[PDB]
């Protein structure tokens, strides 16, 4: 142990012969700790460094640091060092300054996931018992967000591009959907003047004539692009020649009381009747015929699941075990929320009418549509993840 | 209409669902079994239900209710079918994790028939 220059001359050796765990023995011969932490991020041996890092807190930043700013150069895996590092804070700053860049350019799709992004860590910050009101207002505020620049991307593409890949009815759908769920302050990029424009061009082509008239005289109330105007004037001047009625088959139906539903309500996506929440398709944004319900008090949702799996041969609807007994695991649909969030349980009330749901984002569908968007993107077309995950 | 085609096509789609449903409308039983081995456990389930519904292929519901490890109904089934290979069968699966009444309805077979040595691991799980 005395003998320096001949044991230095050794463990740089084993360093240069790409030695490090008897070049680390030697060095902790030694008592050099500095040495050991360069020699496992030059040798890049993260996984080592990091148990240094867990076991002496004080060299965190020097690990970390470096492997953030490289994920960031080669800002997906720079998000996911900033939350491996604890800095949830400039994790949302960087994801908020992404998506309005994106929103910025136009890339309404992107904004979207983004926008899911940064819900997903506001419910993962939310976990926190000081944050957690706070931030679940955001994770709704977020989750909405992330659904408004999802349904506008579809619009943006119709009025942009001189065709439609979007079925008629799906733009309609949507029209409708981002009309009821627009707040008093537009968030920014979306266009109120486009969204009402495809409404009166859909409306006009499916028989709506009274809810295109309404789109035309909201459209009088906003600031027209020039491009827009001389077919926005000629719409308007068509549509008084047509008769003043609406087509039956467009009108939403309230699968809860079956209670039919003016074409725009005033109250914000819910049955004017009953008051039940419309949910929506997120390809084609049709209602789904499924019902929200809730567990009776004393039931824990592993019991729910193994009642509902034992098959034996506003006023919130309320389940007790013997109803959960006689539902078949075909019409409950379940959404597998991270810890502060309860699980939500959905009824379809039309068996015939496959719906499935995405297991990552908990986003609903009519299978056949989740399927073949899945087979041709290979994804999800929410969250961008392949079928090989079935985790929240 | 052209069910075989589109079987085919699902098939190769690995859409096993739309397979099964196609299959079941139409009577194609021998596929129908193929695709429910290839598919999910609950698939499988709603396969062995609707050869319980037909009755006549009883043993398909046996097997299906087995390979998705619903392990009590494909017992009551086999049972109620008098199957005694797919009962040694299932009973060679059934590890201490399983239900205690199962294992002893299990034993009390074994004892009846005479292998009292697979009996005892039961009694004993």
Request: net charge negative; charged share 25%; with cysteine.
């Given at each position: ?19 490090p765990?008897?070049?680390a ?30 076991k ?17 150069e ?14 949830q ?44 009101d706070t931030?679940?207002?955001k ?53 109120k003047?486009?969204i ?10 499916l ?49 809860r ?9 005033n ?8 008051r ?44 007790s ?22 699980w ?11 719906i ?5 984002c ?6 056949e549509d ?23 | 209409?052209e ?13 096993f ?47 299906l ?17 008098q199957?005694?290979?797919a ?17 002893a ?13 697979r ?7």
């Amino acid at each position: 142990k005395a003998e320096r220059e001949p044991l230095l001359l050794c463990a740089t050796y084993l360093k240069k012969l790409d030695s490090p765990g008897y070049a680390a023995e030697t060095y902790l011969k030694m008592g050099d700790l500095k040495s050991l932490v360069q020699l496992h991020v030059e040798t890049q041996r993260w996984d080592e460094a990091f148990a240094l890092g867990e076991k002496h807190p004080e060299f965190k930043d020097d690990i970390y640091m470096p492997y953030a700013q490289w994920l960031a150069e080669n800002f997906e895996e720079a998000q996911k060092a900033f939350h491996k590092a604890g800095r949830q804070r400039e994790a949302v700053q960087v994801l908020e300054q992404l998506t309005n860049n994106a929103v910025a350019e136009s890339r309404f799709n992107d904004a979207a996931y983004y926008y899911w992004m940064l819900s997903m860590q506001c419910l993962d910050i939310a976990q926190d018992p000081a944050q957690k009101d706070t931030m679940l207002g955001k994770f709704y505020h977020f989750q909405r967000l992330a659904e408004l620049y999802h349904g506008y991307h579809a619009i943006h593409r119709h009025t942009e591009d001189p065709f439609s890949v979007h079925r008629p009815e799906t733009l309609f759908n949507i029209s409708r959907f981002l009309l009821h769920s627009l707040p008093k302050d537009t968030p920014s990029g979306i266009s109120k003047v486009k969204i009402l424009f495809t409404l009166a061009k859909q409306s006009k082509a499916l028989g709506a004539y009274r809810l295109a008239r309404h789109a035309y005289d909201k459209l009088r109330g906003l600031y027209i692009p020039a491009r827009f105007q001389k077919s926005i004037e000629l719409g308007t001047l068509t549509i008084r020649a047509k008769p003043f009625h609406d087509s039956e088959e467009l009108v939403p139906l309230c699968y809860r009381c079956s209670t039919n539903n003016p074409l725009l309500n005033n109250l914000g996506n819910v049955c004017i009747n009953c008051r039940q929440p419309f949910i929506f398709s997120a390809s084609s944004y049709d209602v789904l015929h499924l019902v929200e319900f809730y567990l009776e008090e004393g039931i824990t949702d592993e019991e729910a699941i193994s009642l509902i799996d034992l098959e034996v041969l506003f006023v919130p609807v309320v389940v007790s075990r013997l109803v959960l007994r006689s539902m078949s695991r075909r019409d409950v649909l379940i959404k597998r929320w991270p810890p502060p969030l309860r699980w939500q349980y959905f009824r379809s009330l039309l068996p015939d009418a496959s719906i499935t749901m995405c297991p990552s984002c908990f986003q609903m569908f009519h299978s056949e549509d989740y399927e073949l968007l899945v087979l041709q993107h290979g994804c999800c077309p929410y969250c961008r993840r392949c079928k090989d995950d079935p985790g929240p | 209409e052209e069910v075989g085609q589109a079987v085919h096509f699902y098939t190769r789609a690995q859409a096993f669902k739309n397979a099964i449903r196609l299959c079941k409308e139409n009577g194609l039983d021998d596929q129908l079994m193929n695709l429910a081995l290839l598919s999910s456990p609950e698939d499988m389930i709603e396969a062995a239900r609707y050869y319980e519904e037909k009755g006549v292929q009883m043993d398909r519901a046996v097997m299906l209710y087995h390979k998705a490890g619903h392990f009590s109904k494909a017992l009551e089934l086999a049972f109620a079918t008098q199957q005694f290979v797919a009962l040694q069968l299932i009973a060679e699966d059934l590890d201490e994790t399983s239900d205690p009444a199962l294992l002893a309805r299990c034993s009390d077979f074994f004892i009846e028939h005479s292998q009292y040595e697979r009996a005892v691991e039961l009694l004993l799980a």
